[PDB]
Design an enzyme around this catalytic site. Structure first.
Site, PDB file in Angstrom:
ATOM      1  N   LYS A   1      -3.787 -35.941 -49.365  1.00  0.00           N
ATOM      2  CA  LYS A   1      -2.543 -35.042 -49.699  1.00  0.00           C
ATOM      3  C   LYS A   1      -2.386 -35.214 -51.208  1.00  0.00           C
ATOM      4  O   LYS A   1      -2.959 -35.667 -52.187  1.00  0.00           O
ATOM      5  CB  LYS A   1      -1.285 -35.879 -49.063  1.00  0.00           C
ATOM      6  CG  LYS A   1      -0.607 -34.786 -48.640  1.00  0.00           C
ATOM      7  CD  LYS A   1      -1.121 -34.008 -47.348  1.00  0.00           C
ATOM      8  CE  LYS A   1      -0.077 -32.787 -47.146  1.00  0.00           C
ATOM      9  NZ  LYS A   1      -0.645 -32.253 -45.879  1.00  0.00           N
ATOM     10  N   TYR A   2      -1.605 -34.083 -51.476  1.00  0.00           N
ATOM     11  CA  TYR A   2      -1.330 -33.570 -53.003  1.00  0.00           C
ATOM     12  C   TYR A   2      -0.621 -34.767 -53.708  1.00  0.00           C
ATOM     13  O   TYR A   2      -1.005 -35.169 -54.951  1.00  0.00           O
ATOM     14  CB  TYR A   2      -0.649 -32.282 -53.308  1.00  0.00           C
ATOM     15  CG  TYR A   2      -0.085 -31.983 -54.689  1.00  0.00           C
ATOM     16  CD1 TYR A   2      -0.899 -31.392 -55.410  1.00  0.00           C
ATOM     17  CD2 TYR A   2       0.980 -32.124 -54.741  1.00  0.00           C
ATOM     18  CE1 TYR A   2      -0.716 -31.000 -56.761  1.00  0.00           C
ATOM     19  CE2 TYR A   2       1.533 -31.662 -56.204  1.00  0.00           C
ATOM     20  CZ  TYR A   2       0.634 -31.249 -57.045  1.00  0.00           C
ATOM     21  OH  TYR A   2       1.082 -30.770 -58.212  1.00  0.00           O
ATOM     22  N   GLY A   4      -0.468 -37.841 -53.121  1.00  0.00           N
ATOM     23  CA  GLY A   4      -1.050 -39.042 -52.555  1.00  0.00           C
ATOM     24  C   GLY A   4      -1.242 -39.959 -53.739  1.00  0.00           C
ATOM     25  O   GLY A   4      -1.409 -39.537 -54.660  1.00  0.00           O
ATOM     26  N   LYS A 130       2.334 -43.006 -49.110  1.00  0.00           N
ATOM     27  CA  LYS A 130       1.145 -42.540 -48.456  1.00  0.00           C
ATOM     28  C   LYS A 130       0.152 -43.169 -49.158  1.00  0.00           C
ATOM     29  O   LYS A 130      -0.236 -42.560 -50.221  1.00  0.00           O
ATOM     30  CB  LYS A 130       1.100 -41.045 -48.654  1.00  0.00           C
ATOM     31  CG  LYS A 130       0.026 -40.454 -47.798  1.00  0.00           C
ATOM     32  CD  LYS A 130      -0.037 -38.859 -47.812  1.00  0.00           C
ATOM     33  CE  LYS A 130       1.613 -38.383 -47.212  1.00  0.00           C
ATOM     34  NZ  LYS A 130       1.797 -36.899 -47.154  1.00  0.00           N
TER      35      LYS A 130
END
Lengths: 490, 386
Positions: A1-2, A4, A130
DNA sequence: AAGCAGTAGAGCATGC
DNA sequence: GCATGCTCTACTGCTTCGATATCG
């Protein structure tokens, strides 16, 4: 994910002979591990300054852990790289640090088993974020640490399997108890030496990824395709200079106003207009008027012809070059039209010509779309991605005029000498490593305030010529190339 | 054939956008897996492996849908979270809302047969999520503790018991029903009967003799019939005629004094074997204090009037000296004095030349604060005579 | 742009 | 008879932050 973030736990084996000098007066592995950990923190505190970095020593005499085991001492918790964490941690350097660690926690005990990996799992489970990378850096030198009890070996490989299940991976950075890599032992059951990455190679980098614009290319009037316009060479520079109050050591939070209309008072956006003077007469306008006089088109790309790759000279460039890719917010199939257009434009060596308006109100600009086919290899040398590339093109007062009316011919007694000279100086280019002197020494100079060791640290710059090693390498043909045909002779 | 139909089904589990297809897919997968489990002749070795491989594909890309589908498969299939038991414990301090109830719903099923549990649950701060105001979390988290009692050492049971008996002041009768269901075993198999064992094995019995006595004034009858038929069981309150009367002193506990006389005559009046007037008396005593005081004060001297035939000359002195000790204990122990009880003990003692010499330092401070002075004045004057 | 969070407002079931 | 109560999802906006034009 961006958004993350990644995570790293330093598990230190300071137990039996690692705290000894190995009866060797050459290097000490405890100070080597703490130097490597300090290098990792001191790079990633400006390289990638949002990951999670923890330090945990095991085999110690005391204990500190939230399940309350024995011999296991966590020191810090999963958080950012911090100046407090490194100024706390560097008290274990050298023999003075060996004695201070002795009196602070002690050394030597019957160390753990599976339970330290249990502590690592209970250290990762708490974090509510995350986690994208789960790695454990193990600093150990023994390679049969439970070579007298097989129940602990079976339970340790079982618990390492259950740590591999949930997605935790360890890479033990091997210390040098035999120096050379002669321990060809059987430690294949747990794993998925070389230290130079942890040592040197990354003193000024960053990590990021965005898209910078998502525009659409229209061919006729109705055939639209959606492309993300990525940027791939970006000119990083030094961060903004925060303002700070002297005494209370806090930001200043400035504010700004406008008054003194030959009365004083205070103003608003509406009372004042924009203006210009041209010799004798003055113009006045509104802010919407001066923002609307540069208004042409709508954001996107407009197809305006085709051309093969032979007229454009690489004498002609204006700005950096972006990179357009077939995104997925128009239809499932814009990728397919881009793939067909890619194949035809590459095989007939033709390049698109377009007009390009970047955002909501900017004048238009002519670009040329050149294709690029990917290159990978056996070992995945993914050096190019497949997609199209912008090149900008100048208009009118870009190209100036030189004096330019000079043309004198020389004599061909120098060409073989110069061919030998350039074959003497020949090196195969580069792939990386030409780093920035100004930003680099700014990094080191900022290290030398909150770490305040001695002075500005090392400041080598790999962009200087070495005339002393150039003279002997070239040889004594400098004088003959200087005066074979031409004397200056004052 | 039976090689692609199931693959199409477990593949339609992956269609993870709309709520109705994949949750019901997981449920009907649980039905199929359970039918082929108990019906072993058809193979399950393809299908269980297939659905578990789908779940292991699920858990790292997205996790909410993983715990939802595992919850619903485990809703009718126990043994299919063994492969994920460290994953759910890895996820447990990450989930709030309904999903923490979902994880705890999972972890209840695979307990009875699992070793080394309290370490993990202590690590995931269980005694801070046993004390938050949701209701279904607090019901399920106590139904696991009714399952993991007979696996603990008493070193930790005395750490569990300190916020689990904060539930007497709770609403919601199922939650308190669970809390009076666990103490009923912790009393019946920790009776430590002069065995010379431990201080914690005698200390938990103290704090579990507290709550099975404060739970006779609960605000839900129909529940308290259970506690009354527990406490009126043979060899649990000794049921001859008189030993029950003596033992009723033992379960006093000054959190229940406001009801003590009605409860005492209720336990005394249950063991009859007349039918027309005993049953309205049982009915009428527990409504008004003064006629109940009269009923206990007559029952006491009735049995002590029968006792002089049996129970020979030394035993009379033994029972009466124990009773004098108990009444002294009462007057020293009570915290908010109940007047038609303080008067009841100082009215049943005054009429015996074996219980007179009670405690003139206790009678005085009892009847200056209970405002029943003229029964105390008569007691001390009946003492100073004879 | 990259992600989150709210919620306005039109669509399910029973009321002087 | 419309007067009320109740429920799920697309439209609006929030916030960080990286880039870009622009002023000095």
């Amino acid at each position: 994910k961006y958004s993350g973030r990644d995570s790293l736990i330093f598990l230190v084996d300071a137990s039996k002979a690692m705290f000894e000098s190995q009866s060797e007066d050459e290097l000490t592995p405890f100070d080597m591990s703490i130097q490597c950990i300090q290098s990792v923190y001191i790079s990633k505190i400006i390289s990638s300054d949002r990951d999670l970095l923890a330090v945990v020593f095991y085999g110690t005499e005391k204990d500190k852990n939230s399940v309350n085991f024995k011999n296991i001492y966590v020191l810090q918790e999963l958080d950012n790289p911090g100046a407090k964490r490194i100024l706390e941690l560097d008290q274990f350097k050298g023999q003075q640090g060996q004695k201070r660690f002795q009196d602070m926690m002690g050394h030597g005990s019957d160390y753990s088993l599976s339970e330290v990996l249990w502590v690592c799992a209970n250290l990762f489970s708490d974090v509510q974020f995350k986690m994208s990378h789960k790695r454990i850096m193990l600093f150990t030198n023994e390679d049969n640490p439970h070579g007298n009890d097989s129940a602990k070996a079976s339970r340790a490989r079982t618990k390492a399997g259950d740590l591999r299940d949930t997605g935790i991976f360890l890479d033990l950075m091997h210390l040098k108890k035999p120096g050379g890599f002669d321990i060809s032992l059987f430690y294949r059951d747990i794993i998925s030496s070389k230290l130079e990455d942890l040592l040197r190679k990354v003193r000024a980098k960053e990590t990021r990824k965005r898209a910078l614009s998502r525009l659409k290319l229209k061919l006729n009037k109705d055939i639209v395709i959606s492309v993300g316009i990525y940027n791939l060479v970006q000119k990083a520079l030094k961060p903004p200079p925060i303002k700070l109050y002297r005494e209370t050591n806090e930001p200043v939070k400035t504010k700004t106003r406008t008054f003194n209309t030959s009365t004083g008072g205070l103003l608003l956006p509406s009372d004042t207009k924009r203006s210009q003077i041209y010799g004798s007469r003055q113009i006045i306008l509104e802010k919407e008027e001066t923002e609307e006089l540069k208004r042409f088109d709508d954001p996107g790309l407009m197809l305006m012809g085709f051309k093969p790759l032979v007229l454009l000279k690489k004498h002609h460039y204006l700005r950096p070059s972006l990179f357009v890719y077939p995104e997925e917010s128009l239809v499932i199939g814009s990728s397919t039209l881009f793939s067909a257009l890619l194949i035809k434009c590459l095989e007939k060596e033709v390049a698109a010509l377009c007009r390009y308006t970047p955002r909501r109100n900017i004048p238009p600009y002519f670009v040329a779309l050149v294709p690029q086919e990917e290159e990978l290899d056996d070992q995945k040398i993914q050096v190019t991605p497949p997609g199209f590339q912008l090149v900008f093109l100048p208009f009118a007062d870009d190209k100036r005029k030189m004096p330019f009316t000079e043309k004198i011919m020389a004599t061909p007694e120098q060409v073989g000498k110069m061919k030998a000279i350039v074959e003497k100086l020949r090196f195969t280019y580069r792939s990386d490593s030409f780093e920035n002197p100004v930003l680099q020494q700014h990094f080191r100079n900022l290290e030398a305030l909150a770490l305040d060791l001695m002075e500005p640290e090392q400041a080598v710059d790999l962009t200087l010529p070495k005339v002393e090693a150039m003279n002997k390498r070239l040889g004594s043909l400098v004088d003959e190339f200087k005066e074979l045909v031409y004397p200056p002779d004052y | 054939q039976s090689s692609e139909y199931f693959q199409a089904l477990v593949n339609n589990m992956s269609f993870v956008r709309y709520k109705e297809v994949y949750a019901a897919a997981a449920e009907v997968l649980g039905l199929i897996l359970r039918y082929v489990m108990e019906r072993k002749n058809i193979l399950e070795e393809s299908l269980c492996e297939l659905v578990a491989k789908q779940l292991k594909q699920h858990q790292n890309t997205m996790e909410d849908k993983f715990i939802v589908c595992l919850n619903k498969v485990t809703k009718s299939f126990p043994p299919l979270a063994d492969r994920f038991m460290n994953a759910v414990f890895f996820l447990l301090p990450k989930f709030h809302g309904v999903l923490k109830t979902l994880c705890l719903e999972v972890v209840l099923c695979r307990v009875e047969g699992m070793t080394e549990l309290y370490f993990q649950l202590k690590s995931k701060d269980f005694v801070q999520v046993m004390r938050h105001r949701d209701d279904e979390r607090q019901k399920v988290c106590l139904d696991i503790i009714y399952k993991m009692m007979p696996k603990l050492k008493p070193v930790e049971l005395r750490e569990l018991l300190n916020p689990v008996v904060e539930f007497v002041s709770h609403p919601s009768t199922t939650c308190r029903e669970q809390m009076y269901n666990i103490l009923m075993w912790i009393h019946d198999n920790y009776r430590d009967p002069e065995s010379e064992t431990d201080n914690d094995s005698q200390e938990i019995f103290k704090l579990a003799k507290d709550v099975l006595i404060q739970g006779l004034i609960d605000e839900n009858p129909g529940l308290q019939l259970i506690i009354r038929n527990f406490w009126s069981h043979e060899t649990r309150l000794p049921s001859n005629t008189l030993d029950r009367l003596l033992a009723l002193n033992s379960l006093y506990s000054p959190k229940i004094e406001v009801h003590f006389l009605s409860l005492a005559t209720n336990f005394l009046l249950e063991m009859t074997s007349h039918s027309s007037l005993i049953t309205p008396l049982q009915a009428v005593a527990q409504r008004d204090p003064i006629i109940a005081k009269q009923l206990f004060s007559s029952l006491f001297s009735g049995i002590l009037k029968e006792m002089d035939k049996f129970k020979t000359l030394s035993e009379k002195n033994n029972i009466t000296q124990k009773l004098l000790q108990d009444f002294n204990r009462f007057l020293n122990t009570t915290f908010s004095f109940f007047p038609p009880f303080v008067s009841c003990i100082q009215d049943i003692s005054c009429q015996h030349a074996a219980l007179l010499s009670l405690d003139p330092a206790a009678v005085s401070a009892g009847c200056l604060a209970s405002l029943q002075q003229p029964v105390g004045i008569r007691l001390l004057e009946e003492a100073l005579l004879r």
